[PDB]
Amino acid sequence: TPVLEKNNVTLTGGGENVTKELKDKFTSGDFTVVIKYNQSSEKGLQALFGISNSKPGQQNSYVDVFLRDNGELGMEARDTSSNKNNLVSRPASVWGKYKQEAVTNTVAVVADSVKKTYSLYANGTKVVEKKVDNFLNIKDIKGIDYYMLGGVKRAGKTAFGFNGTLENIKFFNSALDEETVKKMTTNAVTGHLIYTANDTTGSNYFRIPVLYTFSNGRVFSSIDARYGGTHDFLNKINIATSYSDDNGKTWTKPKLTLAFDDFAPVPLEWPREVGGRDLQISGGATYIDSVIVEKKNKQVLMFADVMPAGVSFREATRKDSGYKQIDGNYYLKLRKQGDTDYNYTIRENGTVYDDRTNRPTEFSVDKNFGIKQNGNYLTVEQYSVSFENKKTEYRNGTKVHMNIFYKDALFKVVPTNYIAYISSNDHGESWSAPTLLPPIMGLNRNAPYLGPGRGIIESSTGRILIPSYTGKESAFIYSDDNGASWKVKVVPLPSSWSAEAQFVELSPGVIQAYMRTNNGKIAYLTSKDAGTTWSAPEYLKFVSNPSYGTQLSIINYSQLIDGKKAVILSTPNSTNGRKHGQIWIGLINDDNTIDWRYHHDVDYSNYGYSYSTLTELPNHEIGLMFEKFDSWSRNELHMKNVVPYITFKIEDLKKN
């Protein structure tokens, strides 16, 4: 039961006094406030409400909940005389606008005196809970005399004035429990998540969404389910998938499609504070950065990077592919426990050979990288993770198959990165066992790193193209035999670009690779022979990003726009961070230049926008999934429920 409920309060910075209605209602001093609002302007710091001592000198005696122009939700509780100042917040908590309309959000704050915590909720997620030593409730702050909607009265003046409509606001004079407030804050925004914290995947975190529309009208998604927070590395990451047969309206419960079981797919509460956020899961085999393509025969391919347990992308050797060539064939090498050298290879039928004697052993490696001895699986104990802000990785008593990618294996692969792929003949419902890519970069180089998103089938040749990169070169992985065998075109770049790329076809035989650079710009290279040879890079003139850059998404679109063949591009566009997401429409001219005629700002310019993926829906609308946060910032690590799915008509995308 609310002590006060108000509704449809429209404000333009000036606030509304509710002192009469609330003074003396908070007898314990605890509170819960639930606010459903939309903003008419996002600029500045804006308080949804404010409870204060308004007198001269008591400016630092107040409680509020606030929004920032970047989507951060926070609260303060401050007392002037005792000089105590609490601030609790989480980045990337709310939405601003969506297709020209202010987004309705629902947030809440819970101040619990017994356990000395402030909790904040936004759109069904408890975005933060913090225990504080200097806890303050309404009665702890001396001389509270003013209760206000849409600001805080400080020294007789409205501060932090809110611009928007408080659609509904409820004040409660007790700390309401977690599940009740989650439910109260659930709304239409909550529904835009395909993957949610601790869903079927067992993961609390996701990054690197990929969308793809199959030829039968199924809309497919894949994502990194990152268990040990959002770290690229070290981590325990699986690839999860989910699909829609109704144009993206409803989605299957996620499946784990590429996963190792040296660690279980269980939810971990990863620390976000400065002293814990650098912590990593260190002992766990990983799939990361997925790429999808549909072949002409309707078979689907998914590629991902593979990292053995404990192997850092930074530290890992770049001068060993992990393969040995024997009588013209390439076989994966292994080192047995107790040996310094790699004396063994995986040859026909997974049989492990001792290369010194050239004889098969009693050991074999199955199609899922599991080790057998005389037909029986070897096992190891699985690891769990425990926190007590020290983290422990410990053996949990469950036996799993010993695997060549695991820390505790009898036979191990070379500690480097690999690429694996799997195929599906039923539009993504079931998948083959993984195949590791052969040493296409050479025996004495590591595999490339995939550029997440999609691959393409170039139409004139039927060549399958998969984007990847080395750190110094582009590596365009391809097959001219419908995916039976793979080759690579390696293209030196102007600098050390982390060249995450995507392809478009402009006209038959003519393709472009758009990619991330280390110079602030998006580069594109052009091939007029279906990827065999590439021009020097050119740069988009209208995107300006930080030097580190971000992944992009670009797709071909099937319908004419203004009479012309089109492409559609998604990227952040800001020098200040991974922010200011835009979708751009490019119209192909007869000379194969592009007229980049339209752009659309996805939300307000300070709102986070990192890795993204576009797809054309069967109805010819556009689906977008994206990281609605800044995935470079160390302040925005390890956040839950921050990778939404939204959609746009071309008519929406023409606006901005």
Residue numbers in the entry: 84 to 471, 473 to 740
Extract from the study:
The CBM presents a CBM family 40 (CBM40) β-sandwich fold with six-antiparallel strands forming a convex surface and five strands forming a concave, carbohydrate-binding side. Asp boxes, motifs typical of bacterial sialidases, are present in four of the β-propeller blades. Protruding from the catalytic domain is an I domain comprised mainly of β-strands (residues 403–498). The absent N-terminal residues include a signal sequence (residues 1–27) that was deleted to aid structural studies and a short region of unknown function (residues 28–84) of which electron density was only observed for residues 83 and 84. The binding site of the CBM is on the same side as the active site of the catalytic domain and the protein face on which they reside displays an overall positive charge. The NanC active site is a narrow constricted cleft, similar to NanB and contrary to NanA. A primary component of this constriction is the hydrophobic stack of Trp-716 and Tyr-632. These residues partially block the active site entrance providing specificity for α2–3-linked substrates as opposed to α2–6.
S. pneumoniae produces up to three distinct sialidase enzymes: NanA, NanB, and NanC. NanC is an unusual sialidase in that its primary reaction product is 2-deoxy-2,3-didehydro-N-acetylneuraminic acid (Neu5Ac2en, also known as DANA), a nonspecific hydrolytic sialidase inhibitor. NanC adopts the same overall topology as seen in NanA and NanB, with a CBM (residues 85–271), followed by a catalytic domain (residues 272–740). The catalytic domain adopts the canonical glycoside hydrolase family 33 sialidase, six-bladed β-propeller fold shared by viral, bacterial, and mammalian sialidases.
